[PDB]
Amino acid sequence: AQWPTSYDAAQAQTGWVQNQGILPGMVWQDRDVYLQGPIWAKIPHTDGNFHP
Amino acid sequence: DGVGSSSGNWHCDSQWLGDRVITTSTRTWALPTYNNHLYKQISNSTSGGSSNDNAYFGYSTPWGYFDFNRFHCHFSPRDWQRLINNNWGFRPKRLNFKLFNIQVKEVTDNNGVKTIANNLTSTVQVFTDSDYQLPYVLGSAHEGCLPPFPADVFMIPQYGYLTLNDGSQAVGRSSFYCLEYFPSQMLRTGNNFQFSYEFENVPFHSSYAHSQSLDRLMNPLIDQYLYYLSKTINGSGQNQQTLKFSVAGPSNMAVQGRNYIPGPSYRQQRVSTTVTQNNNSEFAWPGASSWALNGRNSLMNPGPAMASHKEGEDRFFPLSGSLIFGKQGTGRDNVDADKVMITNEEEIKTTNPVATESYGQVATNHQSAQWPTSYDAAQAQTGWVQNQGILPGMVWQDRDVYLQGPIWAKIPHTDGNFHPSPLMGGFGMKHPPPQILIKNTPVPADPPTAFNKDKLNSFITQYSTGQVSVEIEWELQKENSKRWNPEIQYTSNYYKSNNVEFAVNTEGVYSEPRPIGTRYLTRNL
Amino acid sequence: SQSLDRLMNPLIDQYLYYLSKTINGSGQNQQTLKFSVAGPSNMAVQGRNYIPG
Amino acid sequence: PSYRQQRVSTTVTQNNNSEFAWPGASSWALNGRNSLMNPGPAMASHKEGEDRFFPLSGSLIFGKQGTGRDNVDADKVMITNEEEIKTTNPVATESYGQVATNHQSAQWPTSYDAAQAQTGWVQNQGILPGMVWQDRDVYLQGPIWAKIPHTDGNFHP
Amino acid sequence: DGVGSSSGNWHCDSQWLGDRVITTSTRTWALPTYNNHLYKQISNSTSGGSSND
Amino acid sequence: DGVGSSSGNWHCDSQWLGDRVITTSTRTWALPTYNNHLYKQISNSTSGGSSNDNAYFGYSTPWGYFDFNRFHCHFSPRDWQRLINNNWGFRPKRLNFKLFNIQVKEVTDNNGVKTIANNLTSTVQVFTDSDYQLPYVLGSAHEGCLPPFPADVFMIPQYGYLTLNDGSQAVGRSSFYCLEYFPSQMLRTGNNFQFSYEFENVPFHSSYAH
Amino acid sequence: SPLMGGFGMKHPPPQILIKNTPVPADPPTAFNKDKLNSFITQYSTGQVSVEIE
């Protein structure tokens, strides 16, 4: 709000989130498979992965 | 049945054992006739022309349901104090549910005077959705729970559900459920109903606060064997670039290397309880920080567990990042701040980011010196991180539970989820306690003496009452801390007052004066 | 057959409050704090346990 | 995942002629206190073909034998580099990628409404499904173990 | 008979098996007094003069 | 339950043995609805401005209690004469309590005329504070005991208790008790209640003069 | 020994509490979260027997 001096005061501002990573409490569905689509894939042999 | 015999007993107490506590609650309920025994399609168009964000399509059913998904339904205030002052964690194990002492009454309203009489031959239908084949509405923090005070008589809420909508219209994928399509038994006089359920394995709720912060886990006496960049120029300037490194360092704890980082964040607008400090503009929706789904904006209600405010300022709260309860007798439309109770998660500030602050800063360019040409050279620039997703090495605490807060929620049946702890607090399960549906069996009035194929729409006015008992066994996690100084404990204030806290007033109205958390004891890390 | 933002009971209010007004309107020094119950008519601001992926 | 770090060159003449160790540090805050994002998420130290660049605080820096403790030169310290994990982890001093920030549209009724496609830089990216990464390497002079903080939740501790 | 006891249950569902399906339906009925407990002879003449058909 | 069957009997007499006497008393009681099923905070301020000596703070409950803590509740005047004219001392040993023949009535008061009818499906809740977890008010010489004459019908008194007070105000140490926080069972039609108790060892009362 | 006369005990005969179970009147057909304050006017009567040796 105002408080000592004037220029310091500023209204609430928001920004757009174009990319969002995983957060706790998130839920989602994986991509659908198709009759012409692939069946399986090999998970790369790495130290870590998420939802492979 | 009969004057000299009952169909059920008292059963209202709490038993404390070594590592277990068993709570039993008994209440008296009243069940009216809902929707005149009809299923009705409902939508936002039936309540005027609203915005796209509030459009819905669903059905209202003549059934009622039992709700005890709140902690005060099972713990007395003193029992809650015993739980939170002596245990590091707790979790439900199994529950027992009983329905008994059914009484069905019929009402006649002729020429003004109203008469109520017993209807001994009427029935009440009860079933449990143990296969989770119906929409689950117990995880939306709705009213109609068992009253916290055992002496109160409560009304059973009406069951309704929503499905897919396009504005106020439906689509072919929308589902219609008839609750009479579930097994129906024939009952005699004096019957009772009961069933048991076992809670699936859930983690203990963290009913403690951390005595250490994530950025202060090092030894304050010993240096690290790691170096950090401390100087880039000698100072003065023309061509003074250099690279100097230093050891950190109890005197430079900020730049020390660390193994773990604070959990995820999602920026919320900051609101002050001192109204003169807020901006002189209407910002509740404009600065709400919401999320969108299929073109519909939904408020980011509490959301990720984040610290409510920085240290030394409890007058600030996130716009929609905290649970807000209403005081006893508080209205429902545009009430003042003194009529509501705003919770704060200040305990988790040791591991979770502040809800009204940026997660941190990140580099947004490549600093470069002169090199061929001049305009190409640019100083280092950073940008604010307003939302940060999960990163490896992240740690966080979940939202606290409250005496007036919800207990459990149903995890949506989807392909994937991450850390399915309910955002309003509690235990998230794939198979939560099943919904218990109840309804009065319709009793038609006198039909005409000539056959008519239309369904009957003239019934005897009836309602039912009875007693309901729910018993839940909880597992306890004891504390074995080596802390020397005394801990912080929840306690009542000795100072005199007109009324006793968590009691009834002169008019006989029970009230809960403040919200009670669970994080009073402390532990390291 | 259900959306993540429409999992609540459309007939029963929540026991949680949300900030609904910050000024009385007109202006010079009109800051205030008003809270409300949501609310089948205000499903957007209801508290929820899970969020989209 | 990634978390942008400032890029510093071992060739001092290539760096900006200004004092930036704290100002461009890329830190995180807790209870009003700023703490350096010391090494942090495991990310590739530099792009291929340039080992003269290192992240500001994204690498373990050991001291040589007999090295002092206050304001020592670069030749007195040993800067590690995680160049091996560049096959799966993002470069520490680069953006994770680009994302769309608007709706491209053609003409349609009126003119000013029309807008070309625009993209923005992603400086920090959290965990997403289908992500894979390698953890930070261990060293002969490095630590062996650590205690996971006793909290309600953590990810990949 | 009695408030605490019923004489019948829900029994309304359908069970699907390999080569069999079992359907169960339960409804509530109302039965009035018909014809004032009398048997009555009826004919087309009692409803006017109709055709031979 | 039923016309042809009762749930309890006469049981009103006194048996004299060698060194023991057994007294049995049966009375008919009436229990109204107290406090409109509410718990109410009470204090001296609610009854005007009294002196500091009479200040109090407590609660009134919708419960009633049974009182037989008077000698005429068990001894007839002739039985009392037999006791005091022939014995140097006496003391209680054990007691048996029974509640039976419960009848719940509902009252309708429309346009003046009052009608009373049976409510066969209603229940009455009874419990004993065998752990002494509630304030004890039977040792204050209060009214509401069983009438000395067996033929009299009496009203069950309302239960209330007091706690710590500072004038008409309360303090943090004050306790609030809810009687519904005790075990509650589901009852059918025609039930009865009974329990036994053994008196702890007490000295004989000196029923003599020196 | 009680000053008004009699036998003083640490564990005297326990208090026996009794109450009529409330029976609410007809509730409204629309849900309301407030506790019910409309009950059927009732009272109870019976017999009590106490035997002391």
UniProtKB/TrEMBL annotation, chain D:
Entry's localization field: Virion
Residues that bind Ca(2+) 2: E84
Sites where the protein binds Ca(2+) 1: N81, E84
Signal sequence, renumbered to the chain: none
Highest taxon above the source species: Viruses
Annotated beta-D-galactose binding sites: W22
Similarity section: Belongs to the parvoviridae capsid protein family.
Identification of the protein by name: Capsid protein VP1
Residue window of the full protein shown: 482 to 631 of 736
